[PDB]
Amino acid sequence: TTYADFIASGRTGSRNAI
Amino acid sequence: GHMGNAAAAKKGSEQESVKEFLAKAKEEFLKKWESPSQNTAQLDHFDRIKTLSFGRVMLVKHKETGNHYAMKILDKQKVVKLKQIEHTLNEKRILQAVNFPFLVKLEFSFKDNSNLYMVMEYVPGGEMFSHLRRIGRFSEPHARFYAAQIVLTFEYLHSLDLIYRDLKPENLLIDQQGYIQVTDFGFAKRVKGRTWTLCGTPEYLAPEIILSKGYNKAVDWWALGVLIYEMAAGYPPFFADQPIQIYEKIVSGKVRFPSHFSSDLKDLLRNLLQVDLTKRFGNLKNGVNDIKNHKWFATTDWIAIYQRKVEAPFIPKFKGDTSNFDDYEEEEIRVEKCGKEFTEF
Ligand SMILES: Nc1ncnc2c1ncn2[C@@H]1O[C@H](COP(=O)(O)O)[C@@H](O)[C@H]1O
CATH class of the missing domain: 1.10.510.10 (Transferase(Phosphotransferase) domain 1)
Known part of the structure; x- marks a missing residue:
């Protein structure tokens, strides 16, 4: 599912600027 | 129509x-x-309460009024080493000029020998x-x-x-x-x-x-x-x-x-x-x-x-409670480095 894919991305925490 | x-x-x-x-x-x-406004408070006007690459954000309490604030502390030598002079100056310049109900308010700013300080209204919801x-x-x-x-x-x-x-x-x-x-x-x-x-x-x-x-x-x-x-x-x-x-x-x-x-x-x-x-x-x-x-x-x-x-x-x-923020280790704040660069601050 999309939600599972989001968890799998490893990018569920705070995101830094580039 | x-x-x-x-x-x-x-x-x-x-x-x-x-x-x-x-x-x-x-x-x-x-x-x-x-x-722009400059030098509208000093560090000993505030009690440090709690920490919330360029520097730190601290909950502080104004000694005279009792109001809480979120104080952004930037180490000048470190801003200049990371090539962040223009961005730091510009951010403070913007903040002291804008006025809108959904934009955080810069209540005071000042500097000393080592750091730049932006004292923002404390927003307790995180x-x-x-x-x-x-x-x-x-x-x-x-x-x-x-x-x-x-x-x-x-x-x-x-x-x-x-x-x-x-x-x-x-x-x-x-x-x-x-x-x-x-x-x-x-x-x-x-x-x-x-x-x-x-x-x-x-x-x-x-x-x-x-x-x-x-x-x-x-x-x-x-x-x-x-x-x-x-x-x-x-x-x-x-x-x-x-x-x-x-x-x-x-x-x-x-x-x-x-x-x-x-x-x-x-x-x-x-x-x-x-x-x-x-x-x-x-x-x-x-x-x-x-x-x-x-x-x-x-x-x-x-x-x-x-x-x-x-x-x-x-x-x-609604618990100046830090209920909606994390916890960090509390390093000290020591204090004329980088004068020319931050004349405008
Ligand atoms: N005005 C404020 N009131 C309360 N917390 C703040 C304030 N400014 C920054 N913080 C905290 O410090 C972090 C850094 O924010 P910033 O560096 O301004 O993007 C925020 O995500 C909050 O956890």
Whole structure:
């Protein structure tokens, strides 16, 4: 599912600027 | 047509009043922009309470008044070593010149031999990010209440020729009335025409930033689309293990929506998350009005939002309590380094 894919991305925490 | 006479007259009058407000707001901004305030407090005016690469953010208490503040502490030698002089000066210059109910207020600023200090009003609800991950997702009315505040804030900022460039839930604080406070102007720039810097956060980057084009304020309207999607879905529209895979999705012109999104919401997002700049809402002849007059915002009373008279959908637990923030190790603060560079601060 999309939600599972989001968890799998490893990018569920705070995101830094580039 | 869609509107009868009464509705059309009311909308036209409302839009003309916005123009009148923005013209005065620009005059006030420009006076402060051209003559910034400096050195309006000192460090021993405050008790350090708790810590919340350039420096630290601390909860502090004003000794005389008892009010709490969030004090941003920047180490000057470290700003200069990381090549952040212009961004630091510009952020403080912007903050002391703007005035809007959904923009954090710089209450004092000063410097000493070692550090720069920006004393901001303390926003005790913490960041939207934590609340969104905890709750999972916001219902559409809840999302819309926040979205409306960002629309009005970008309408304000863009009228001053300020591009914001780092919209994300991490940068949105929730105050005691449940309203938003935009923080962190480190990537904001006064830009009449185009600008070229690669900056932002990967999930929120507009395609024209990824594709190394010159770009304009429309990148903020793309980012609003990403924000509304993430608030309503609980995850952003474009994600992957690594940034480069995120960028491939951003530029593809394809976006998929959860089945619980309303058709009105999908239509708005397709017009904000529009790769073709000649078609993107916020970037057309009718400007911000294409967004404000969209069906998804039909129930939004823009003046009541601005006046903070709408009952918020969520009030953070009101415990100067640090209930809505994390914990960190408390290093000391020691104190004339880098004088010339920060004369303007
Ligand atoms: N005005 C404020 N009130 C409360 N907390 C803040 C404030 N400014 C910054 N913070 C905290 O410090 C972090 C850094 O924010 P910033 O560096 O301004 O993007 C935020 O995510 C909050 O946790």
